[PDB]
């Protein structure tokens, strides 16, 4: 029955910042709200229970407030170890339900992706099934758009994207987009282009090749 909605889903911050995350319950849950911190590959950790009680051991820079439907987690003067995903959770009534999570990621100066396109190897062509790969390297922020154009025709479907976790040293992301085609299809067209949109680029960049060059 009871749902809890967090805001924002993503937060860009830097060490020193004071950040707040809000949690709204679909109906009143009194003070029965808990907050957790989750870091990739490690045990989830509870921060706050009964909306505002700090769990012993947890730094006092974490604090929770609110009652009824509207709740807030505040981290004052963020440290690097605080960059993580945060979830709220109501336990007023069964079943316990969690928010969708707030990922706190590292802000940095805007960086345009370096863009590369790779035609399929002759080995892959001879196999009868080919992959065209577009690489977007070391950019920030995460938000980026890739379009495939084959002889000027926008290709939708038959591609998949993968994006790295934020680099622990330079705070950037990288993204691959992979177009898959039968060789027969591949051979029937000439120009393969990857068109890239990103905040760090004041006009979209297009990397293309002529099949067979």
């Amino acid at each position: 029955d009871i749902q809890v909605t967090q805001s924002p889903s993503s937060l860009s911050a830097s060490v020193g910042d004071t950040v707040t995350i809000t949690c709204r319950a679909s109906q009143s849950i009194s003070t029965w709200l808990a907050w957790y911190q989750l870091k990739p590959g490690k045990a989830p950790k509870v921060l706050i229970y009964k909306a505002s009680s700090l769990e012993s051991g947890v730094p006092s820079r974490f604090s929770g407030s609110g009652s009824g439907t509207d709740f807030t987690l505040t981290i004052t003067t963020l440290q690097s170890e605080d960059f993580a995903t945060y979830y709220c959770q109501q336990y007023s009534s069964k079943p316990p339900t969690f928010g969708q999570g707030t990922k706190v990621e590292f802000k940095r100066a805007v960086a345009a992706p370096s863009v590369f396109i790779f035609p399929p190897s002759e080995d892959q062509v001879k196999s009868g099934t080919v992959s065209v790969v577009c690489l977007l390297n070391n950019f920030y922020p995460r938000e980026a758009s890739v379009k495939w154009k084959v002889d000027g025709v926008l290709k939708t479907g038959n591609s998949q994207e993968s994006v790295t976790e934020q680099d622990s040293k330079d705070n950037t992301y990288s993204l691959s987009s992979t177009l898959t085609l039968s060789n027969t299809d591949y051979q029937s067209h000439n120009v393969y282009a990857c068109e890239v949109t990103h905040q760090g680029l004041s006009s979209p960049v297009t990397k293309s090749f002529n099949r067979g060059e």
């Binding site: 229970y49 928010g99 999570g101 790779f118 190897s121 994207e161």
Partner: protein
């Protein structure tokens, strides 16, 4: 103080039963209530169930009740979860935890659970795909100061594959992407590296790809065409 450790088969076939067990240490197991919470890749947390250590009385999420059984073995300080008729929607990190609760102020009633301690969790993946080693193809590039090259590591199962460059000697500028599941049921990824453009005609670049489950090792040389 309290320690928790999940374990399970990493791979379960569709329509079969997913079984996971949690070992508990450092507390009076029978005194507490113990729960399972899961997180599907790319989705949110979902409570599965909770069981009383002493009586073995169990509570389920209505969404999973028709398929779920939580058990306990007090002598072993373990509790367990069995999920029947599983599908890919059941692929998830499965966490065990302790569930705490308290009187909610109204007659005879209590809060539901919050979870004060969790295990590190265990990934269980649901798939009927059969083990397969990857195919590896060079991603070949030059008028900028730096150039990108890489290896496409395609059609393997299950995860993981490891990718190194020049038997490990090349490490900086390397991005090995998270694998993505194809409609095949097979995984695909690329590993790329950025190098100096001047080094392209002089240095050698080989990606080393290892897939333990199929005992596959491929060394593929990447060079300009």
């Amino acid at each position: 103080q309290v320690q928790l450790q999940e374990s399970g088969p990493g791979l379960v076939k569709p329509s079969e039963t997913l079984s996971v067990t949690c070992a508990v240490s450092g507390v009076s197991f029978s005194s507490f209530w113990w729960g399972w919470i899961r997180q599907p890749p790319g989705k949110g947390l979902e409570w599965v169930g909770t069981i009383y250590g002493s009586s073995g009385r169990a509570e389920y999420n209505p969404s999973l009740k028709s398929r779920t059984t939580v058990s306990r073995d007090t002598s072993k300080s373990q509790f367990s979860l069995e999920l029947t008729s599983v599908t890919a929607a059941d692929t998830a990190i499965y966490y065990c935890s302790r569930g705490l609760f308290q009187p909610n102020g109204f007659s005879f009633t209590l809060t539901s659970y919050w979870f004060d301690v969790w295990g590190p969790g265990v990934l269980v993946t649901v798939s009927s795909a059969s083990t397969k080693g990857p195919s590896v193809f060079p991603l070949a590039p030059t008028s900028e100061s730096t150039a990108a090259l890489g290896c496409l590591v395609k059609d393997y199962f299950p995860e993981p594959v490891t990718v190194s460059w020049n038997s490990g000697s090349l490490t900086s500028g390397v991005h090995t992407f998270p694998a993505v599941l194809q409609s095949s049921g097979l995984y695909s990824l690329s590993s790329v590296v950025t190098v100096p453009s001047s080094s392209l005609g002089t240095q050698t670049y080989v990606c080393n790809v290892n897939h333990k489950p199929s005992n596959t090792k491929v060394d593929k040389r990447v060079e300009i065409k």
